[model samples]
Target: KSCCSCCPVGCSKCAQGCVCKGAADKCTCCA
Candidate 1:
């Protein structure tokens, strides 16, 4: 939830906690 709170729209440096993990940047958030 924290990561999602910090991530912005169209962000590329997201993680598993990010909401855009698989929806944006082709899941480029975390490994």
Candidate 2:
């Protein structure tokens, strides 16, 4: 959330939480 939103191009870093945990992992938002 914080990391992704900080990007100028708005690159959402969902994989950091999603693929790593192989679950939702509290990723209810994106950049």
Candidate 3:
């Protein structure tokens, strides 16, 4: 899934996660 694979390395560094579903259609703390 793009939601999980799309995120960057730093994106997972924090618990906040991606926090942006508008760009790649994902969400904050999303997989």
TM-scores of the candidates are 0.20, 0.15, 0.17
Across 1-31, the per-residue lDDT of candidate 1 in tens digits comes to: 2344334544444433343534523444334
State the weakest 10-residue window (summed lDDT) of model 1.
15-24
Winner on lDDT between 2 and 3 is 3
Local distance difference test values of all predictions, in order: 0.41, 0.34, 0.46
lDDT of 2: 0.34
Cα error, residue 9 of model 1, in Å, equals: 3.4
Residues 1-31, candidate 2: write the lDDT tens digits: 3233223333445434422232333333342
TM-score of model 2 vs. true structure: 0.15
What's the C-alpha lDDT at position 21 in model 1?
38
- Residue range 1-31, candidate 3, lDDT tens digits: 2334445544444345435545543444436
Alpha carbon lDDT at 10, candidate 2: 32
Indicate the residue-level lDDT of 30 in model 3.
Answer: 38
Q: Highest TM-score, which number?
A: 1
Residue 6 CA error for candidate 1 (Å)?
Answer: 1.0
Instruction: In model 3, state the lDDT of residue 16.
Output: 50
